[PDB]
Amino acid sequence: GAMNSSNYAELFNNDIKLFVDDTNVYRVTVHKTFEGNVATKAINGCIFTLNPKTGHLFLKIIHTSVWAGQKRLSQLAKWKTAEEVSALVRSLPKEEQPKQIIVTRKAMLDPLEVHMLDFPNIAIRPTELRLPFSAAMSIDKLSDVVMKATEPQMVLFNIYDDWLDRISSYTAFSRLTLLLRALKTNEESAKMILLSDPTITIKSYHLWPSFTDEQWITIESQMRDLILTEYGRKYNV
Amino acid sequence: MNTVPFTSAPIEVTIGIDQYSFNVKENQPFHGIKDIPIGHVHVIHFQHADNSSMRYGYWFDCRMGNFYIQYDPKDGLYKMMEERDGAKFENIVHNFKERQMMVSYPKIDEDDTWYNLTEFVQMDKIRKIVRKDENQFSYVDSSMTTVQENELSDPAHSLNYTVINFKSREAIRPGHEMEDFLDKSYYLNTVMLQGIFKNSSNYFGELQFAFLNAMFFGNYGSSLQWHAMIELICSSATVPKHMLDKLDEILYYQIKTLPEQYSDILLNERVWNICLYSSFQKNSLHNTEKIMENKYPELL
């Protein structure tokens, strides 16, 4: 069944599972034509496929050439996502293949099920959680590799940096979802919080700054404040 | 004109013959049904007055033998049987006919309803869906489950309809996932019509038999089969024009005959709205769309 607040801790057990988010697969800018009509121009996108226990991220970059000459692109994007996820699974050794794939948007269920017919024992599940993975393109190093790509490419990251050396997967996922929710609600402010102090750097092989345990607590508090505010600045409370 | 005579009517029962029905009282001097049109399959069906649960009945073709009904007080139902002595049977029937102990199949001459509902239904194909090879007729009841239902538990008592599953390797060619899921023409035309059914007449025969079992017995798995076979055609972009025109006639007479009080349960809202208003064939079923809109506009 669906993944929800009640079965949340299943994400951190020892059954391999992947989240798939397709929000950023088909990305466009909308603009006016010389005749005053509206047109779209695609820009490179990505599939966000994440193991929440280990932090392993399989970022498949979707180059704009895949849309050339195709119709109904928003529909095609879901099937392209499912094709690439199926190809990733087939590329993994059997002992590394997931036992479940959790899609962040329910419209991915049928495309992924059909592409995974050869894997009847991999469960395809929706979720009732409103996860903020669309904000992945607010992480500078991820946005940079997507925008620079000149052809289809898979890039591997650990979205938790080295956090698992000091904290559990549950705590790491909670920190990630906090950071991303902040970036989604007020990107400018969120990035100001993360980078305000010049002396805390991002290692070359990392995505986020090298905060001490104490600095993470302050940062996390600053992100919760931002989210609550915006929720006020929004609903006026 | 053929006859299905009855040994007796020991229990009060509503008896159906095709789309007709009449009530028989307990121990009423009823001895069967005469004037049954030759050239069609027929169904004779029963609902006991004391247990409206379990409608049950028998599909038969009088060209294949002489059949009669005798009530079994042990198994508690009216059973169809074959009489191999033709002289004895013709004599019994003549005696009953002389004493006017039979009802007459009440066909109006202008009326083509039964032909239109059974146009493609063949007794030999019924006997492959309902496997009981020692009899020439076929028993069906409200509770019998289909092979497909069983896969998701007595095999000898199952409805062996052709399994249709839109999210299956049979339906989806490797490499054509999106294509085949969104346009089921290859599954319809190559897998089912060319491969399994062989021709559209056999496909329509099973579709029509499934509907009739749903309508006469409330057989839920037959209703599922009927809708699946409709949905497979409506969800195909490429269908022979003769098949689309025939489907429109088939469905029109099915919707025409359905009891209004059962449309709530026997009509799947999603399939019909998809089929009449969203599918590739949304504009190819004019007669069916017109009767559905004038008879069941609520469902839509």
Ligand SMILES: CN(CC(N)=O)Cc1cccc(Cl)c1
């Ligand atoms: C008289 N036999 C029973 C028998 N086997 O002696 C039954 C029967 C057969 C054909 C027509 C009718 Cl209605 C009754």
